[PDB]
């Protein structure tokens, strides 16, 4: 249900360099170390991404810290959180996010992740939440705030847990595209790292289930599963996971590359002159010389039409709602 | 300490709007979510009402919820209301509550608004 | 919520002090509570979080949450003893309170 989470907005994030961390698996076969032209879409290096302060914990005094947002979706995203100790319980999307439009519900649990495509009301805020007993220690029943009108629904799936639970920073990070027809999922949870920053190496970001629905999607919402109490804002007290629950959200645009003991990744893009050379001759060194690669046009600045000065209007009545012919 | 003074009972028709006051006394107002505990003169208590610092979400009980608004602002220093179509319910003395979250408790009470119909 | 299981009524008068009972699975999600209705009425809060009695409180004794029913914190009985309990057994996060029509206490 809504109680309503959303925070008029507090402090920014910066937005850190992503160095690479985000080639998934293409395939199954058995070459090794080949140098392969095939053609996927990929995450573009060293330009802007963004993370987000999840559970923002203050000093002594703060508000209550529940800023999960809902973003569009340019078909595809990497997705990357620094956080261990399982607070993400799960994904919400949808195109008008409401019960015009079926809606992937993607929600992990104790022993299953449920996969859901139905058009439900949501909620504009939801949480889950995830306490502690006094008798038991660990007792981790998990309540799915999140969907509400189960109407016209066909999709149930049950599978393994998604993120699942050692000292230093694992990094459980992922890759979704919207593709019409398919939806694909790349994931891949790191060992144990002590980064600030998103942590070092590249990704072996490994298929686990595929989604054969591939409708519509336009826009975005993560889950933090959270006890927060209804009482106090400035005496907040739930104190889960404070400040290492920052996740990192990627983005993809069309652009080209090469794979490489076994085959990894690499590019094929043209972006400045230099991999402009590198696209036309298709080639990753260019030697010495003048290489004609590309053609320059002088651009249409603006249009005009030019017609002449004409005022009535053709008779189509006077035979079309004639008498006869 | 905290006490909750709070007046203004008196004179309603069944099926009429009344607006009850919580005003308070030695807490900060944007930084307790302040609750409603009802008793009726007979019996034992129940909670009833509950609201955030702002007016965002405000949740009532499982038997009365909906048929109150109970809110806050900042320059009126009262709590207003108003009950929308009592069923012969109305008929207790109203409290607040000021929690402090000790994992769900309630620490002091005031003296206790009573708003009675006439039958 | 649902109502908590109480007794109406329990009256015994040696100067042994018989544990008011108080059951259900409720109190492992957060746990039962003691508010007071004293002479004047006028309640407060006696003991919170199950362990402590706040500041400036006539000294009774406390709570120790043994599984399911929890021993009360009352202590040797003085003339004051009138007032009753309320037992209070919390949820997780939907955040719902009940009460109960509660005790009494007379000698």
């Known amino acids: 249900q809504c109680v309503n989470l959303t925070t008029r907005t507090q402090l920014p994030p910066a937005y850190t360099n992503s160095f690479t961390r985000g080639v998934y698996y293409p395939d199954k076969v058995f070459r090794s170390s080949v140098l392969h032209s095939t053609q996927d879409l990929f995450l573009p290096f060293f330009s802007n991404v963004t993370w987000f302060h999840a559970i923002h914990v203050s000093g002594t005094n703060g508000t209550k810290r529940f800023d999960n947002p809902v973003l569009p979706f340019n078909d595809g995203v990497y997705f990357a959180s620094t956080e261990k100790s399982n607070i993400i319980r799960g994904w919400i999307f949808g195109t008008t996010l409401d019960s015009k439009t079926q809606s992937l519900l993607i929600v992990n649990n104790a022993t299953n992740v449920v996969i859901k495509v139905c058009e439900f009301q949501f909620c504009n805020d939801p949480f889950l939440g995830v306490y502690y007993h006094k008798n038991n220690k660990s007792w981790m029943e998990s309540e799915f705030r999140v969907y509400s009108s189960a109407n016209n629904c066909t999709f149930e799936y049950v599978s393994q847990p998604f993120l699942m639970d050692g000292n230093f920073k694992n990094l459980r990070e992922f890759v979704f595209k919207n593709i019409d027809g398919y939806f694909k999922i790349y994931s891949k949870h790191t060992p144990i790292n002590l980064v600030r920053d998103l942590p070092q190496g590249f990704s072996a970001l490994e298929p686990l289930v595929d989604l054969p629905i591939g409708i519509n999607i336009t826009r975005f919402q993560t889950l933090l599963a959270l006890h927060r109490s209804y009482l106090t804002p400035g005496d907040s007290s739930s104190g889960w996971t404070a400040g290492a629950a920052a996740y990192y959200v990627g983005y993809l645009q069309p652009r080209t590359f090469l794979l490489k003991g076994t085959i990894t990744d690499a590019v094929d893009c043209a972006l400045d002159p230099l991999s402009e050379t590198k696209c036309t001759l298709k080639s990753f060194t260019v030697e010495k010389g003048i290489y004609q690669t590309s053609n320059f046009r002088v651009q249409p600045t603006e249009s005009i039409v030019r017609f002449p000065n004409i005022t009535n209007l053709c008779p189509f009545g006077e035979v079309f709602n004639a008498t006869r012919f | 300490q905290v006490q909750l003074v709070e007046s203004g009972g008196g004179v309603v028709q069944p099926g009429r709007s009344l607006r009850l006051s919580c005003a308070a006394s030695?807490?900060?107002?944007?930084?307790?979510?302040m609750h409603w505990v009802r008793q009726a003169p007979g019996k034992g208590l129940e909670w009833v009402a509950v609201?955030?610092?702002?007016?965002?979400?405000?949740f009532y009980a499982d038997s009365v919820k909906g048929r109150f608004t109970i809110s806050r602002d900042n320059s009126k220093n009262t709590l207003y209301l108003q009950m929308t179509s009592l069923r012969a319910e109305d008929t207790a003395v109203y409290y607040c509550?000021?929690?402090?979250?000790?994992?769900?408790?309630?620490?002091?009470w005031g003296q206790g608004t009573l708003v009675t119909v006439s039958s | 919520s649902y109502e908590l299981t109480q007794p109406p009524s329990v009256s015994v008068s040696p100067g042994q002090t018989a544990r008011i009972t108080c059951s259900g699975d409720?109190?492992?999600?957060?746990?039962g509570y003691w508010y007071q209705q004293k002479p004047g009425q006028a309640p407060v809060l006696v003991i919170f979080?199950?362990?402590e009695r706040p500041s400036g409180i006539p000294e009774r004794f406390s709570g120790s949450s043994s599984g399911t029913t929890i021993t009360l914190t009352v202590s040797g009985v003085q003339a004051e003893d009138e007032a009753d309990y309320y037992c209070?057994?919390?949820?997780?996060?939907?955040?719902?309170?009940?009460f109960g029509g509660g005790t009494k206490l007379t000698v």
């Open positions: 509550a000021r929690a402090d979250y000790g994992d769900f408790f309630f620490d002091y």
């Open positions: 030695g807490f900060t107002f944007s930084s307790y979510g």
């Open positions: 609201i955030w610092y702002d007016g965002s979400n405000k």
């Open positions: 409720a109190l492992s999600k957060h746990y």
């Open positions: 979080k199950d362990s």
């Open positions: 209070q057994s919390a949820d997780s996060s939907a955040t719902y309170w009940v």
